[PDB]
Symmetry: C6
Subunit: 30 residues, 6 copies
């Protein structure tokens, strides 16, 4: 139901943030 | 239902993070 | 009520993320 | 109670994101 | 209660955004 | 249960934001 749908979107938000962290690490390296 | 409304705003937040990751990838490419 | 207020706050958060994506687009435009 | 405390922290998150947007605008300008 | 636990994680997320805003302010100072 | 899963996802999100703050600190170190 709905509480699970909410947790799923939080998952998808963490996933985007991980990709943000990697782009920044690339930038910090060059 | 407001619980569905909450999940939808979270999905929209994920969408914006997706766009942020793309722009940072572009900057890393500099 | 309160679940609505939570959703309205997530929408404001999404709005801020839009502006962040926009400035990042500007910075990418190097 | 608790649902209000949650909305309050979402407020404080949006506030930090607004300050992030302004720092990025400054960077996009110079 | 898990609702208190949720508010606490949100506060911790706000703390991290605070640190992100500081570092960006430092970069804007370049 | 489900509210716990929501909180555990917010904690993972906080963890990603820590790494973002760290890379930004590195970039600030210009
Ligand atoms: Cl990397
Ligand atoms: Cl690109
Ligand atoms: Cl500005
Ligand atoms: Cl500083
Ligand atoms: Na995830
Ligand atoms: Na990468
Ligand atoms: Na990439
Ligand atoms: Na935008
Ligand atoms: Na606010
Ligand atoms: Na400013
Ligand atoms: Na400032
Ligand atoms: Na950190």
């Amino acid at each position: 139901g709905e509480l699970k749908a909410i947790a799923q979107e939080l998952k998808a938000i963490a996933k985007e943030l991980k990709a943000i962290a990697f782009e920044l690490k690339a930038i910090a390296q060059g």
